[PDB]
Subunit: 64 residues, 4 copies
């Protein structure tokens, strides 16, 4: 299925059993890749090639 | 003067006193808990064991001003 | 080769290996340069922790039921 | 003024220091065993901490940090092999 490991304020990582909504990894054995530099606190949809995962990042940081 | 270094689904990293032996970080959900990190050089601490998608409040005092963090969902 | 070392620390190393067809999981075997093999079974990436800094280690991953050398970091004074 | 190595990788080193108060900032100096000194300035004093990247795997490095103005010294060797 789909697996997400590291959800930060800035990133989310995905792992599939290679090419998000509020890139291309040409393998060869790269089962995973990590998106970088996105907006904290946002809902998302991720799909890899069915099937999709929904993600929310986390506000806030530095500082308040 | 407190900074939130990293926010994860289950953890938070914090960075931030005169004649301080150690520091006590207190945190609560939206249940107060407190863990003290001894050492003046202990200027950072990572709080683990947090629930994903939950709002936390963090404050550190030497042994104002606090910060709020929401974990991933 | 087919097995690569992504990150190396004084006390840990992370490894990634190509998937095998029709396999329920993998057994990673590692040893010191003495040395006696130790294996950890993970049902395709894993980080082996609890290692001694500044020493040469050997790692291999095996399909079940049927490679790479790593040196950790060294530093003074701390 | 102790100087601490929090994390060491094949290509990077993490350092933390006491840092005398109040420093306008910090300068990190490093050199390989045979190589030349290189200097990086960190505007303090928020950060008693810094991560040095871009190092060669399996290399001897020497580090010392000075408050600015204008110390504590540490020696580091990184790990090998990676690749493959
Ligand atoms: Zn939702
Ligand atoms: Zn040496
Ligand atoms: Zn070697």
């Amino acid at each position: 299925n789909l697996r997400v490991t590291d959800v930060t304020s800035t990133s989310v990582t995905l792992s599939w059993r290679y090419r998000y909504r509020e890139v291309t990894v040409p393998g060869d054995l790269s089962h995973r890749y990590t998106v970088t530099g996105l907006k904290p606190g946002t809902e998302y949809e991720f799909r890899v090639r069915p099937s999709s995962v929904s993600v929310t990042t986390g506000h806030h940081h530095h500082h308040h």
